Amino acid sequence: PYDVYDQLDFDVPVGTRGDCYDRYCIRIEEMRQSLRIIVQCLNQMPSGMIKADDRKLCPPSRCRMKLSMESLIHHFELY
Amino acid sequence: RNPVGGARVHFSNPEDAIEVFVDGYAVKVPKGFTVLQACEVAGVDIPRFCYHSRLSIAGNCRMCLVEVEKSPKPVASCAMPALPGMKIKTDTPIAKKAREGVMEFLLMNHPLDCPICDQGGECDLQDQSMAFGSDRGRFTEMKRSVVDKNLGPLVKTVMTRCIQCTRCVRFASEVAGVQDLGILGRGSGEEIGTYVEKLMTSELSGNVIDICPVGALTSKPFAFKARNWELKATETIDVSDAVG
Amino acid sequence: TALNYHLDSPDNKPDLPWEFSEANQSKVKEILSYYPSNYKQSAVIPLLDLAQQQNGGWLPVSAMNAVAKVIEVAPIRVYEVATFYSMFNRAKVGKYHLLVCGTTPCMIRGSRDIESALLDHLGVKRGEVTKDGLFSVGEMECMGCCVNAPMITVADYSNGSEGYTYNYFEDVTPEKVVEIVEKLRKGEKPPH
Amino acid sequence: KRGEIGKVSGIPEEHLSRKVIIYSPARTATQSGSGKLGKWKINFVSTLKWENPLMGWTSTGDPYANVGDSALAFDSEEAAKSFAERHGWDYKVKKPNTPLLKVKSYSDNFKWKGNPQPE
Amino acid sequence: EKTHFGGLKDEDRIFTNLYGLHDPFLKGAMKRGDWHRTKDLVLKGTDWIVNEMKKSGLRGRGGAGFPSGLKWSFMPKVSDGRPSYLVVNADESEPGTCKDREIMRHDPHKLLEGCLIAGVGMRASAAYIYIRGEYVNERLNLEKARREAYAAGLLGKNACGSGYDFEVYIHFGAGAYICGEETALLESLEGKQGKPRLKPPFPANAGLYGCPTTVTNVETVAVSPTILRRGPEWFSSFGRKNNAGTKLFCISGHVNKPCTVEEEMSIPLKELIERHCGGVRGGWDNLLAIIPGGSSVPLIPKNICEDVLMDFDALKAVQSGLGTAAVIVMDKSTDVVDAIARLSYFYKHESCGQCTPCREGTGWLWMIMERMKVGNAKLEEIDMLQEVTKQIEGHTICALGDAAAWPVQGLIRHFRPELERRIRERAERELLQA
Amino acid sequence: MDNQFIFKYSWETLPKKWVKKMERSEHGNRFDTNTDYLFQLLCFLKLHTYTRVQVLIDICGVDYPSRKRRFEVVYNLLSTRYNSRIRVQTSADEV
Amino acid sequence: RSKKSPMELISEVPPIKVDGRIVACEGDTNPALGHPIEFICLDLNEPAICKYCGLRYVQDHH
Amino acid sequence: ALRRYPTGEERCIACKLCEAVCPAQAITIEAEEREDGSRRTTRYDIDMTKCIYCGF
Ligand SMILES: Cc1cc2nc3c(=O)[nH]c(=O)nc-3n(C[C@H](O)[C@H](O)[C@H](O)COP(=O)(O)O)c2cc1C
Ligand code: SF4
Ligand code: SF4
Ligand code: SF4
Ligand code: SF4
Ligand code: FES
Ligand code: FES
Ligand SMILES: [Zn+2]
């Protein structure tokens, strides 16, 4: 598991004959379960920031690059 | 390990050679080397702003501060002579906290004009700020500013970006031989200039563009033409004179 | 308006010549006799202050060049020395430069209620010489424990290097400053 | 030159007879850092460029216009020499110029001139 | 006694004529006792003088508090061609200091004899007295005393008729507070900008003109000729064990009758204030804070002003300093934040601007202090003050950065409730306005 | 099952003359072997009960012009039964 | 007025009167929509030019 | 689109920070010092046949 996939509830569809029809039923079920995961993500999405705070690896805010010297240096070096 | 930049240490005699521990590594240096030079022999490259190997030592910027065991306060490695048995420490929290303090002080009155600075992709200030500096600035008050002065048709001058390392003054006094440039004033209001309106007439006056670690001194003919990353570097020789 | 650079003006420009005096050459020799002949640069401050006294309380760019010639250094060194120290006036001060605004210890006892009264009495801003050319206003360097906070320093450049006197006056009322300035205008010197 | 690898590589025969320079790029004069040092590069001496007469862009017809600067880098002189030897390129080696650490002390700024000599 | 440290009889005082009641020139100097058998003191050898100074336990009176005899022992004993120099540091520019001026305008010959004695004890060939530039009248008085000394043969070739050749010169500054520092003074005296040097080259090996030299305060130099004559055992019998002697105090601030007085080295601060000077204005209850030793040293609140000894070590254990021993008494009728902000402005104005932490840190400290002077700051700004002060301390070339950082730390250490109170009060006047 | 278990098991069970470099980290447990033992190692790692690696994810090459053996061939492997990944690398020149 | 180049257009805007010795230029009324902050020292006789905007600032009284 | 200030001055300062981030190398910029001394572009051309419209 990666990201928050281990905090979400969804089933894994498994086939029985291996033919083209099972690949289709599973391709239906994987999309119903994707709808389920989307609903859970919408309901449980928290508040906060959307990027890592290590601005040595992430771009500064456009209001901070035009107001702080180190933020402008980080922007210049990153871009 | 090898010295930084393949530097060659000339031992006049094997007898006059002290031993130091740069990071727990045994390093042999002649009597007379400084802590910074001893670290350079041991492959460790210390940050520097005001130290130039061809200019006299002047511990202004306080950026090369390291930790010495028998020292209550960090020492300027550029000026501190190496002693036998001395244990230097460069990657300790003390040396770090000193370096992010000094970078924070240096980037406090510096203008927010990296995009228009001709030193954009080749500045020592921002390169060391990324590496040895911090991430967030705590300064919000009004910065200082100075007017720009004409030094001739070769050196473009934007003195708001000066970090006051006095390398240009030392070069003019020692290497160029034409004493026309100096540090004027006292305190945060100190400025580099000629006081009177005069132009740099030395034949070696253009070398102040390179010794300047920031974009305070830049070439006027090569103003805004291109950035360093756009340029292909060819190692060639001179044909203008017989020096080559 | 203390600036770290010089703009050429009719009053002070490098073209104007400046030697000391017939009377002041003995002082120049005596000053230079205190240091080894190979270290004549060490006599830059006692020569710059002498030039300031002789010229009338201020240092034109010609005086700095003359001092550089006397001590045989580049004129940039003399500019560096003159700009660093706060007792060297590079602008043009009046005949009796008056030093008013205080420092840390004195304001606890009230040193910042003395400047405006005089400023509006003589009616020109700080660093501006009156029309007749007698008086000027500047910031003092407080010298002692400052028991009597309202102190004013009177730099006298009327008689040049022969009648220059640097006095501190203690406990001077915002109207007693007017009294002492009126006394100075006539010519008499108040006691301290 | 045993340029057998050049023959079994796929490089056209015209580009296998190029003359290259093996050198170690030096430190730039505008920076005091010494991080981009110790790496060896092969310079193909690709200078045949011109100007596009529609937009002023720089046109070229040399495939080895940026290879030695972008991708082909070596950690030592021997590696670059072996690479050139196996690819059949006529090479010349430029030894790098290295700085010499002299004795410098802060006290030399403040040195006695000597007794005043009336010479 | 050891239990009762304080109170000098008029006989045991060193600086007689400290009030200007008698002639300060050569006549009074000889009648008072100056220049008395100085030939005997110089004809007893350099080593003997240093031994006596070491036995007397004379710590430096310039603020640092370094033992004088051990400092003099650092001078070269064999001349290698470089002449040795003595430099008397008379450039007192600290606010609220009145000592060296009173010494050189009332006892010039004590200073001259001290220069001669110290030059003999350090094998120095010349002495430069560096006077503050504002002391024009004091400079003229010292020059007249120098002329009188030279005319009487007490100085110059064959000083006091003893074979020692000592020359005394009077250099003066031009209004810079940094020029009082040991190496910045040497820079100023060499004809350059008064910017301090780095320490690894020590003045005892490379000082004035690249030659070995020693920089000493006026008080340390002035008491030297009388320690030898009266006896180190007499001098060492005042004050505590390690730090002993008699030191001048310029008591100022909110006290009834501020004055300058000489008292034992271990005089209690409360007894000092309430005995020589009057009681604190409005009583000892009105007391709020005392600056122990001038601008450089940190602050001490009332609770620890009780039973504190005015010592180099006692005040240091209280995380303050004796400094120049110039107390500045502050009552509850003064805003301490205003005072500390003004100290920040003074240190911003007097920084030479050579090294990065002091050139920029002092200005940043002043701006933050000005903002908090009216509460125009957040509660999380006080910690940034501590961080900035710790970033300034220990990274500067000289001790002016430390002296510019200590007052803020003292304010934060004993008056944080006041800063938070005014910040909250400002915030309330903003929430209740719009 | 895990990098801590697979490393210790393969240390003991594998013939020593096959593998000459064993890095154990969080980026991936790697095995570096000679080119004349690659098939033997991969056949052992496909049939052994406790190291049932039945999926070959991909085969990639990496070019190192500064090395004598210029090319590095990497075999990323996957074991579905024990939920573990193994990476096996060899080195070969142009001929 | 396409005949006027941006140089001639920025050369026609009168300099802004500032009372103090220093002014901060951001380039727009909303700081986030302009150029990085630029502090300009007004201690000369000629108007001082912003290196981003081209706007000129001159000291008002002294 | 290249924007200009409300005063009529073009906002581009020839920093070439967009030419170095362009993943498709679709931008070519030539700059020099203008008669006023300001840092401006003489040539600023974009290849829309190379542009990937990424917004970098
Ligand atoms: C900023 C600064 C100013 C100083 N001002 C003085 C001064 O005015 N007088 C003085 O005796 N020492 C002053 N000192 C201390 C000097 O270092 C002094 O010469 C040295 O401590 C020797 O003092 P001593 O004579 O007591 O041994 C100052 C130090 C600093 C850092
Ligand atoms: S000198 Fe360096 S940090 Fe300063 S504006 Fe120019 S590129 Fe940026
Ligand atoms: S102009 Fe450049 S070299 Fe000269 S002091 Fe300033 S930053 Fe240093
Ligand atoms: S701490 Fe301040 S006064 Fe001392 S050298 Fe540094 S800048 Fe100058
Ligand atoms: S060169 Fe590109 S990034 Fe720089 S100002 Fe012009 S459009 Fe913007
Ligand atoms: S490089 Fe040593 S203090 Fe600047
Ligand atoms: S503040 Fe001016 S003499 Fe006291
Ligand atoms: Zn602007």
Side-chain angles (χ1 to χ4, degrees), chain C residues 18 68 82 92:
Chain C
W18 197 97
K92 183 176 74 174

Side-chain angles (χ1 to χ4, degrees), chain G residues 18-42:
Chain G
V18 181
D19 68 353
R21 293 179 66 188
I22 188 165
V23 69
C25 192
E26 182 65 26
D28 189 358
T29 45
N30 180 18
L33 292 181
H35 66 76
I37 188 70
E38 182 92 331
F39 295 93
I40 308 167
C41 200
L42 307 176

Side-chain angles (χ1 to χ4, degrees), chain E residues 176-187:
Chain E
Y177 162 73
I178 187 58
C179 276
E181 190 276 331
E182 264 189 14
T183 58
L185 188 153
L186 297 186
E187 297 294 326

Side-chain angles (χ1 to χ4, degrees), chain D residues 16 70 109:
Chain D
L16 271 193
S70 302
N109 308 350

